[PDB]
C-alpha cells in the first residue's frame, strides 16, 4: 500500500494551514482531481467543527474555503458528464489509491455535501442502481403487474438493460457501416428470471407485502385467537417477529465501516424514527414475559401491553411511506411544528381551569366531594368548549342535581343555592353573558392563531426541500441492496444459510460489488489522463 | 332482455349512467374565462387524496383493533368483528366530541348467550356486576389522544397542500 504521488503531498500541506493562494496552485498539479477536492472539503469541515474557540478564523475562512472546493468539484464533474456519461460513472465509482483506497462517492457522502449529491448524474447513477437489473424508464404499473404473474417477465412486458444495449450496439455498428458505405454480453434465457428476483425494487414490494401480512396476522391473533394457552398461530407470530429482529441485526454488522464497534450504533440511534423499533422490540418481549407468567391478574395486563404495542407496529409504516417524492416533504412539515402544540394547549388549559373554578364557585356552596369538584371544575368546562353553542346552553335550576342530603351518591351533583323555590339567586342571564364572553374568547382568538402559525411556516419552508430528500434517498437504497432475497417469513432460513456460509471460514464477498470497484492498470491510466484533460478544459 | 331479476339490474346500470351524463356538463362549463382556470386546479391535486386517505385508514384500523381487543373476549362473529373494528371507529371520527363519548358498560350488548343474534354485540368483560374491569377513564384518555391526533395533525396538512 501507500503509493507515492508527489501531487497530494504538496496539496495536503497547502490545505491544512488554511492558505488559499497556495492551495489554488496546488490543485492544478494533482493527477486525479475530484477525489482530492472532496477530500479537502471533508478535512476542512472536520477541522472547523472541532475547533470552535478561535471564532473568526474557523467560522469564516475554513467554511468559505470548503464551500469553494465543493464548487470546484461540482464544476469538474458536470464538465465530465456532458461529454460521455458511460465513462463518467466509472470515474465516480472507482477506488483511488492516492487517498488511502477509499472511493470518491463515500467521501462526498460522509462530509455532508448537500450540493454535490444533488447533481443530476449521481441521481441517475442511484436510480440505475436501485432499479436493479431491469432497465429504467419502465412505468410502475407494468412492474407490479409483472410481479403479479411471474411468466409475463419471460414473455417480455418490461424492457431489459442487456437487450437494449445489444440493440443499441448493433444500431451503432449499422450506422458506422452505412457511413462507410455511402464487449457486450449476449442475453441469457433461463437466468433471466433469477436475475429479475434480486433487484431492490422487487424486494421492497415483497417486504411491504409481508408487512401487511404481519398486521393481518397480529390482528387475527389478538382479537380472535387469544387464549390462556398458545396456539400455532401465536407461535408463527413469535418466530416471525424474531426473524425481523435477526434481519435487523445482520444488516448492522455487514454494512461498510464494519470494522470496529458502536459507530453504526451511534449512527442508528441518532434519529427519531429508530426510537419506535427500539421501544417496540423491548415492549413486545415484556408482553411475552407477562403472557407466559400465567397468573390470575397479570395475564390481563400482559394482553394490555401487547395491545399497546400494536399501535407502534402500525405507526412505523408511515415512515416507510416517506420514500416517495410526493409524500417525502409532506411528513417533515408535520414533524417540524410538533413542539408548539403542547405550550398552546397549556395556555388554553389555564383559561378553562379559571373559567371552571369561577363558575362552580359562584352559585354552589362548599361541596365535600373531591371527585365532584374535579368533575364539575375541569371536565364540564373542557367538555363545554367543543359542543355547539345552542347545544351548550344547558342551564336550569333543577333537573338532576340533589342536595337536601349532603351529596346524593348515585351520580348527582350538588344543587345550586336557591333563594326562592325553584329559582336561582344568581340571574341566569349573567351565566349566559359570561358563557358568551368565554366561548367568544375561546373560539376565535386562540385556535385561529394556532392555525395561523402553520400556514406561514408552510409557505416559508418550500424553498430548501429538494436536497435533503436526495441525501435520504441514498440513506435508504444501500440497505436493501444488502438484504437477503427471500421475504421476511423465510429470512430466518437465509440468515441461517448466511451463517453456515460464514462458519465455513472462507469469506470473499461480492458485498457492494457495484459500489467499490478496482480497475485494471491501463484503463485507470487512460481514464485519469482523460479527466485531467477535462479539468484543463474547465 | 325481459327477465325476472335481470330487469332490476338493467334499471340499476341506467341509473348509474345518469350520473355520468350529468357529470359531463361541468366540462361544458369550462369554456368561460371565469370558470376556466378553476377546474384545472381541482384536476391537479386529485392524486394525493387517495394516498392521504390510506395513511389515515391505517391509523383508524389500528385504533379499532386495539379498542375491541382490550375489553372484549374472543367473538366468533366475523361480521361483528368487522363492524366493531373498522366501522365504529370510522364512524367515530366525524361525530362531535361530546357526542362521541358513548361509553357505558351495559346498555344494548348481550353476552350470556354466545352472540344474541338480533343486532347485539358482545358485552364487555366484567369483574364486578355492572362494572368494567378496565377503567372508563382510560378509554376516555385514549380516545382524547386518538381524536387529538386525528383532527389537528392530519387534515390540516391535507388543507395545507392545496393553499400553497
What is the rounded distance in angstroms from the CA atom of residue A6 to the CA atom of residue A4? 6
Distances (CA, A) of B100 to A54, B87, B96, B142: 61, 14, 6, 13
Give the resolution to one decimal, in Å.
3.8
Distance of alpha carbon A114 from alpha carbon A472, whole angstroms: 11
* Residue A378 in grid coordinates: 375541569
Whole-angstrom CA distances from A166 to A90, A189, A195 are: 20, 15, 18
Flag whether residue B146 sits within 8 Å of chain A, measured between CB atoms: no
Confirm if A320 and A208 have CB atoms less than 8 A apart.
yes
Is there a contact between A7 and A31 (Cβ–Cβ < 8 Å)?
yes
DSSP B75-126: ---HHHHHIIIIIHHHHHTTS-HHHH----SSSS---SSS--TTT-PPPPPB
Q: Is B92 on the interface with A (CB under 8 A)?
A: no
Please name the residue that has the C-alpha cell 472532496.
A38
CB contact (8 A) between residue A321 and residue B51? yes
Q: Which of A327, A330, A454 sits opposite B156 (nearest CB)?
A: A454
Nearest residue to A434 via CA among A350, A363, A347: A363
CB A377 within 8 A of CB A371: no
Chain B segment 98-117 residues within 8 A of A by beta carbon are 98
With beta carbons less than 8 A apart as the criterion, state whether A329 and A465 touch.
yes
Q: Spell out the long-range contacts of A413-416 with Cβ–Cβ below 8 A and sequence spacing 24 or more.
A: A413/A367, A413/A372, A413/A375, A413/A376, A414/A364, A414/A365, A414/A367, A414/A369, A414/A372, A416/A363, A416/A364
Q: In this structure, what C-alpha cell is assigned to residue A139?
A: 412505468
CB < 8 Å to B138, chain A: none
How many C-beta atoms surround the C-beta of residue B13 within 10 A?
A: 8
Q: What is the C-alpha to C-alpha distance for residues A450 and A345, in angstroms, rounded to an integer?
A: 10
| Rounded Cα distance, A37 and A104, in Å | 10
- List the one residue out of A146, A144, A141 whose CA is nearest residue A157: A146
Q: Please, which residues have CB within 8 angstroms of residue A467's CB and are 6 or more apart in sequence?
A: A114, A115, A117, A118
Mutate to test the interface with A, among B55, B59, B62 (most CBs of A within 10 A): B62
Angle at CA A48, nearest 5°, toward A45 and A53? 170
Query: Rounded to a whole number, what is the distance in Å from the CA of B54 to chain A's nearest CA?
Result: 10
Q: Do B66 and A310 touch (CB under 8 A)?
A: yes
Is A292:A305 a contact under the CB 8 Å cutoff?
no
A475-505: string of b/e by CB count within 10 Å (b at 16+)?
Answer: eebbebbebbebbbbebbebbeeeeeeeeee
Cβ A310–B48 below 8 Å, yes or no?
no
Distance CA A132, CA A197 (A): 9
* For A332, nearest residue in chain B (alpha carbons): B157
Residues of A with Cβ-Cβ distance to B153 under 8 angstroms: 334
A219, A300, A318 member nearest B55 (Cβ): A318
- Let me know: does B66 contact A307? Beta carbons within 8 Å: yes
Enumerate the residues of chain A whose CB falls inside 8 A of the CB of residue B157. Answer: 330, 333-334
- Cβ <8 Å between A222 and B160: no
Tell me whether residues B133 and A222 touch, CB distance under 8 A.
Answer: no
Q: CA-CA distances (angstroms) from residue B5 to A499, B1, B10, B11?
A: 64, 10, 9, 11
CB contact under 8 A, A223 and B70: no
Chains A, B: CB pairs < 8 Å: 74
Question: Which residue of B58, B63, B75 is in closest CB contact with A317?
Answer: B58
Three-state secondary structure of A211-260:
HHHHHHHHHHHHHCCCCCCCCHHHHHHHHHHHHHHHHHHHHHHCCCCCCC
Q: Treating both helix axes as pointing N-terminal to C-terminal, what angle do A200-223 and A465-480 enclose, rounded to 10 degrees?
A: 80
Backbone angles phi, psi at A418, to 5 degrees: -115, 135
Cβ neighbours for B92, distance < 8 A, ≥ 6 positions apart: B100, B143, B147
Amino acid at each position: 500500500d501507500t503509493v507515492w504521488d508527489p501531487g497530494r503531498d504538496l496539496f495536503l500541506w497547502a490545505v491544512v494551514q488554511n492558505n488559499r493562494e497556495l492551495a489554488e496552485i496546488g490543485w492544478e498539479q494533482c493527477r486525479d482531481c475530484i477525489a482530492a477536492a472532496l477530500a479537502a472539503s471533508k478535512i476542512l469541515r472536520k477541522l472547523a467543527q472541532e475547533s470552535g474557540e478561535d471564532d473568526s478564523e474557523e467560522a469564516t475562512e475554513m467554511l468559505e474555503l470548503a464551500n469553494h472546493y465543493e464548487k470546484q468539484a461540482i464544476g469538474v464533474f458536470s464538465e465530465c458528464h456532458s461529454w460521455d456519461a458511460q465513462r463518467a460513472q466509472k470515474l465516480l465509482i472507482r477506488i483511488s489509491p492516492s487517498w488511502g483506497r477509499s472511493t470518491c462517492l463515500w467521501l462526498a457522502l460522509e462530509a455532508h455535501d448537500k450540493s454535490f449529491i444533488a447533481h443530476s448524474g449521481v441521481q441517475a447513477l442511484l436510480t440505475q442502481i436501485w432499479c436493479g437489473e431491469l432497465s429504467v424508464d419502465n412505468p410502475h404499473w407494468k412492474v407490479l403487474l409483472c410481479m403479479i404473474f411471474f411468466p409475463l417477465i419471460y414473455t417480455g412486458f418490461l424492457t431489459f438493460r442487456r437487450d437494449e444495449d445489444i440493440q443499441r450496439q448493433a444500431e451503432r455498428t449499422e450506422q458506422q457501416k452505412l457511413a462507410m458505405e455511402s464487449e457486450l454480453k449476449p442475453l441469457n434465457c433461463s437466468s433471466r428470471l433469477m436475475s429479475f428476483l434480486k433487484s431492490p425494487q422487487v424486494k421492497f414490494y415483497w417486504n411491504i407485502a409481508s408487512y401487511f401480512g404481519f398486521l393481518w396476522l397480529f390482528a387475527v391473533v389478538l382479537m380472535i385467537d387469544f387464549q390462556t394457552s398458545p396456539s400455532w398461530r401465536e407461535l408463527l407470530l413469535y418466530v416471525w417477529l424474531t426473524s425481523l429482529v435477526c434481519e435487523e441485526i445482520r444488516q448492522l454488522y455487514h454494512d461498510f465501516d464494519g470494522s470496529g464497534f458502536r459507530r453504526k450504533a451511534k449512527m442508528y440511534i441518532k434519529d427519531l424514527w429508530n426510537i419506535l423499533d427500539v421501544l417496540s422490540i423491548v415492549l413486545f418481549i415484556a408482553g411475552l414475559i407477562c403472557r407466559l407468567q400465567a397468573s390470575d391478574t397479570v395475564f390481563y395486563i400482559g394482553k394490555v401491553i401487547l395491545c399497546i404495542d400494536f399501535i407502534i407496529f402500525c405507526l412505523r409504516l408511515m415512515a416507510i411511506f416517506s420514500i416517495s417524492r410526493t409524500l417525502g416533504p409532506k411528513i417533515i412539515i408535520v414533524r417540524r411544528m410538533m413542539l408548539d402544540l403542547f405550550f398552546f394547549m397549556f395556555l388554553l388549559s389555564i383559561w378553562v381551569v379559571a373559567y371552571g373554578v369561577a363558575k362552580q364557585g359562584i352559585l354552589i356552596e362548599n361541596e365535600e366531594r373531591l371527585n365532584w369538584i374535579i368533575r364539575g371544575a375541569v371536565y364540564e368546562p373542557y367538555i363545554t368548549i367543543f359542543g355547539n353553542f345552542p347545544t351548550n346552553i344547558d342551564n336550569t335550576l333543577f333537573d338532576i342535581s340533589s342536595c337536601s342530603v349532603n351529596a346524593s351518591d348515585p351520580l348527582k351533583p350538588k344543587c345550586p343555592m336557591l333563594n326562592a323555590d325553584n329559582t336561582p339567586v344568581f340571574p341566569e342571564w349573567l351565566t349566559i353573558m359570561m358563557l358568551c364572553v368565554y366561548l367568544l374568547f375561546a373560539n376565535i382568538l386562540l385556535l385561529n392563531l394556532l392555525i395561523a402559525i402553520f400556514n406561514y411556516t408552510f409557505q416559508e419552508v418550500q424553498d430548501n426541500t429538494d436536497t435533503i430528500w436526495k441525501f435520504q434517498r441514498y440513506e435508504l437504497i444501500k440497505e436493501y441492496h444488502s438484504r437477503p432475497a427471500l421475504p421476511p417469513p423465510f429470512i430466518l432460513l437465509s440468515h441461517l444459510i448466511l451463517f453456515i456460509r460464514g462458519v465455513f471460514l472462507r469469506d470473499l464477498p461480492q458485498r457492494h460489488k457495484n459500489f467499490r470497484q478496482e480497475l485494471e492498470q491501463t484503463e485507470e491510466e487512460e481514464l485519469l489522463s482523460w479527466e485531467a484533460y477535462m479539468k484543463d478544459n474547465y
